[PDB]
Design a protein around this ligand. Structure first.
Ligand SMILES: *[C@@H]1O[C@H](CO)[C@@H](O[C@@H]2O[C@H](CO)[C@@H](O[C@@H]3O[C@H](CO)[C@@H](O)[C@H](O)[C@@H]3O)[C@H](O)[C@H]2NC(C)=O)[C@H](O)[C@H]1NC(C)=O
Ligand SMILES: *[C@@H]1O[C@H](CO)[C@@H](O[C@@H]2O[C@H](CO)[C@@H](O)[C@H](O)[C@H]2NC(C)=O)[C@H](O)[C@H]1NC(C)=O
Ligand SMILES: *[C@@H]1O[C@H](CO)[C@@H](O)[C@H](O)[C@H]1NC(C)=O
Ligand SMILES: *[C@@H]1O[C@H](CO)[C@@H](O)[C@H](O)[C@H]1NC(C)=O
Lengths: 58, 236, 216, 54
C-alpha cells in the first residue's frame, strides 16, 4: 500500500447530479475493487500459509 | 454637531395667511438631514416634514418647504387657529449628534412608548429612568433621549445606535448612562451627578430603521415617533 | 455551531479567531446552526469549501479600511438579526454603503496584489424586499454592478423580489466571491446595491487537508 | 406571481422564454420591444431579455 495525505469526501448541489451519482459510482467502484482483491488475497494467502506449513513438516 | 439658527422664535399672523420659517446652520449640510415638527404646550411633539421638501403621514398639504445647503426652509400655505404651536428643527449630524433649533411659535391673531420614573431628586444625587415599548419591534430602530426646559430651546441629551455606537454631548457625558434591552422591549437611563440644568422635561424617542428588516416600514433620516415625556427636577 | 458562512464573513456569534493561522482539518457538525443572519444565495459554496479544504498559509488583512475608503457613502448601518448578545451588528469583514443623506454617487474602485501571496475576496449584491428602500438608499431603480478581473468578471442588475419571512427578513443579499492571484487586479464598479470588502483573506494554498461533519 | 410548497414533497417546475422570428409578433402580442423576465428563488434565480433572431 501507499497511503496518501488524503481528503476523501465531497459535496454537491442538486444541479450537478451528474457529478453526484458519478462520484458515488466512482468511489463505490474503487471500494468494491479493493474489497474483492483484498478478500481473495486473505483467503488465498491463508491457504498458501497452510500449504507452507504442511510442506515444511512434510 | 453644528449650531442652528431658527427664524423666528415666535411670530404673530392672521387667518388665511402663509408663514415662512427659515432654519439655517453654520455649514452647508446636504438636506435629507433635517426634519420638522410641531407641538402644542401640553401635548408631545408631532411629525410634519423631512428633508426640506417632503411630507409625513396623516396630513393636509399646506406645510411645504424648500432650501438647501446651509439654509433650510419650511413654508406654510395657510394658517389656522388649530395650528397654535411651537415648531422645531431637528437634524441628524454626521457626527451622530442630533441638533435642535429653539422652537418657533405661531400665534394666530383674531405603537406607543411609555416613560417611567420622572420626578424629584436631590441635587448632586442619583436617579434612573426607564422606557417601555408597545406594539412594534424595539430591535430595529435607533433610539434617542431628549430634554426640554419649559418654554425653552430643546437640548439633545443622548442617543445610541443598535450597534452600540453612543453619542452624548461633551457636557452631559459621564453623568448619564444608557442601556438597551430588545428581548425585554425596554430602555434604561441610569443618571448621576444631577444639577439644575437637568431641571426639565424629558422624552424617549424612537428613530431610524437601521438597514434591514421585514415590514411595510420605510425609513427617513427623521424620527419615527416620540413618547409623552416626563418631568425631572433636582431640589431641596 | 457556526457555518462556513458565519465563520468566513464575521458573524459576531462566531469567534473570528485570526490567531488560527493554519490548521490540520476543518470541523463542523452536519446541521450547522448559524447560517447567514440576513439570508441570501451563496453561490459556489462547494467550490469555496474545496478551495478551503486545505491551508498552507491563511490570514486576515484589511484590504480597504472602513475608515477613509468610503467618505462619500455612509458606511455604518447594520441589521438586527446579525447581532451580538442581543444587540445589532453586521459581519466584520464587509461593509454596507449608502448615501450621504440620500446622496448616492456611483463608484469605481480597484486593488491588485503587492503581498505576492494569493488572495480571497468576497462581496454581495442587494435584493430589497420593497422599492422604497431602493429609491431611498441608492436613488436608482436601475441596478448595475460590474466586478471585474482578468480571469473572472461578472455584472449584476437586480430588481425587487418579494420573498417570505426568513429570520424576520424578506430581503436578500446574494453573496459572490473569488480567488485572486499575485499580479492580478480586481475592479468594482457600481450604482449601489453592494456589499463591499472591509477585510480580505490572504493565503497560500494548502494540499490534501479537508472537511468533517461530526458531533463527537 | 409566486408559489411555495404546502405539499411537503419536492416539486419540479418548467417555464419558457419567447424568441419570435419577427418583431410584429413582439409589438402586437406583448407591446414591448423590451424583454425582461426574472424567475427567482432562494437557490436558483435568473433573468431573460431576448431579441428577435431569424
Ligand atoms: C445563531 O443560532 C442561534 C440558534 O439557532 C440563533 O438563535 C435562535 O434564533 C431563532 C430564529 O428563529 C430564534 O427563534 C425566534 O425567536 C424570536 C423571538 O426572539 C421570534 O420572533 C421568532 O419567531 C423565532 O421564534 C431562537 O429563539 C434563537 N435561540 C437562541 C437560543 O438564541 C441565533 O439567532 C443565531 N445568530 C446568528 C448571529 O446567526
Ligand atoms: C450551540 O447550540 C446549542 C443549542 O443546543 C446552544 O445551547 C444553549 O446553551 C446556552 C448556554 O450556553 C443555554 O442557555 C441554552 O438553553 C442552550 N440551548 C440549547 C437548545 O441547548 C449552545 O450554547 C451553542 N453553542 C455555541 C458555542 O454557539
Ligand atoms: C467625494 O466627492 C468629492 C467631490 O467634490 C471629491 O472631492 C472627493 O474626493 C470624493 N470622495 C470619495 C471618497 O469619492
Ligand atoms: C452614475 O451613473 C449614471 C447613469 O447614466 C451616469 O450618468 C453618471 O455619470 C454616473 N456617475 C458616476 C460618478 O459614475
Amino acid at each position: 500500500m501507499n497511503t496518501q495525505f488524503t481528503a476523501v469526501g465531497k459535496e454537491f448541489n442538486k444541479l450537478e447530479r451528474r457529478m453526484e451519482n458519478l462520484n458515488k459510482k466512482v468511489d463505490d467502484g474503487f471500494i468494491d475493487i479493493w474489497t474483492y482483491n483484498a478478500e481473495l488475497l486473505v483467503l488465498l494467502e491463508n491457504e498458501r500459509t497452510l500449504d507452507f506449513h504442511d510442506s515444511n513438516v512434510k | 454637531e453644528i449650531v442652528l439658527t431658527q427664524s423666528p422664535g415666535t411670530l404673530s399672523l392672521s387667518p388665511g395667511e402663509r408663514a415662512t420659517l427659515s432654519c439655517r446652520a453654520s455649514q452647508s449640510i446636504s438636506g435629507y438631514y433635517l426634519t420638522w415638527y410641531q407641538q402644542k404646550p401640553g401635548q408631545a411633539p408631532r411629525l410634519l416634514i423631512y428633508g426640506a421638501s417632503s411630507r409625513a403621514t396623516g396630513i393636509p398639504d399646506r406645510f411645504s418647504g424648500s432650501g438647501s445647503g446651509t439654509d433650510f426652509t419650511l413654508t406654510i400655505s395657510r394658517l389656522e387657529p388649530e395650528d397654535f404651536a411651537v415648531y422645531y428643527c431637528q437634524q441628524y449630524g454626521i457626527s451622530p449628534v442630533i441638533t435642535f433649533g429653539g422652537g418657533t411659535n405661531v400665534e394666530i391673531k383674531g405603537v406607543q412608548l411609555v416613560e417611567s420614573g420622572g420626578g424629584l431628586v436631590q441635587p448632586g444625587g442619583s436617579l434612573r429612568l426607564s422606557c417601555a415599548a408597545s406594539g412594534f419591534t424595539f430591535n430595529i430602530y435607533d433610539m434617542h433621549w431628549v430634554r426640554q426646559a419649559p418654554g425653552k430651546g430643546l437640548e439633545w441629551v443622548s442617543g445610541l445606535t443598535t450597534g452600540g455606537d453612543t453619542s452624548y454631548s461633551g457636557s452631559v457625558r459621564g453623568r448619564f448612562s444608557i442601556s438597551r434591552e430588545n428581548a425585554k422591549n425596554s430602555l434604561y437611563l441610569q443618571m448621576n451627578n444631577l444639577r439644575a440644568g437637568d431641571t426639565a422635561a424629558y422624552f424617549c424617542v424612537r428613530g431610524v430603521r437601521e438597514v434591514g428588516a421585514t415590514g411595510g416600514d420605510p425609513f427617513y433620516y427623521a424620527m419615527a415617533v416620540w413618547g409623552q415625556g416626563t418631568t425631572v427636577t433636582v431640589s431641596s | 455551531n457556526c457555518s462556513v458562512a458565519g465563520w468566513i464573513l464575521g458573524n459576531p456569534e462566531c469567534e473570528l479567531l485570526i490567531s488560527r493561522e493554519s490548521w490540520s482539518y476543518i470541523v463542523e457538525k452536519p446541521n450547522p446552526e448559524n447560517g447567514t443572519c440576513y439570508p441570501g444565495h451563496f453561490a459556489d459554496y462547494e467550490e469555496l469549501r474545496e478551495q478551503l479544504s486545505s491551508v498552507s498559509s491563511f490570514e486576515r488583512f484589511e484590504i480597504f479600511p472602513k475608515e477613509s475608503s468610503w467618505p462619500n457613502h455612509t458606511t455604518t448601518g447594520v441589521s438586527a438579526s446579525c447581532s451580538h448578545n442581543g444587540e445589532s451588528s453586521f459581519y466584520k469583514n464587509l461593509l454596507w454603503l449608502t448615501g450621504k443623506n440620500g446622496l448616492y454617487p456611483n463608484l469605481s474602485k480597484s486593488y491588485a496584489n503587492n503581498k505576492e501571496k494569493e488572495v480571497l475576496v468576497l462581496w454581495g449584491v442587494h435584493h430589497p424586499p420593497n422599492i422604497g428602500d431602493q429609491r431611498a438608499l441608492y436613488h436608482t431603480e436601475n441596478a448595475y454592478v460590474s466586478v471585474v478581473s482578468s480571469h473572472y468578471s461578472r455584472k449584476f442588475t437586480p430588481e425587487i423580489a418579494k420573498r417570505p419571512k426568513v429570520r424576520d427578513r424578506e430581503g436578500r443579499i446574494n453573496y459572490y466571491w473569488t480567488l485572486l492571484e499575485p499580479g492580478d487586479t480586481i475592479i468594482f464598479e457600481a450604482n449601489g446595491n453592494l456589499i463591499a470588502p472591509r477585510y480580505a483573506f490572504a493565503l497560500s494554498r494548502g494540499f490534501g487537508s479537508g472537511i468533517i461533519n461530526s458531533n463527537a
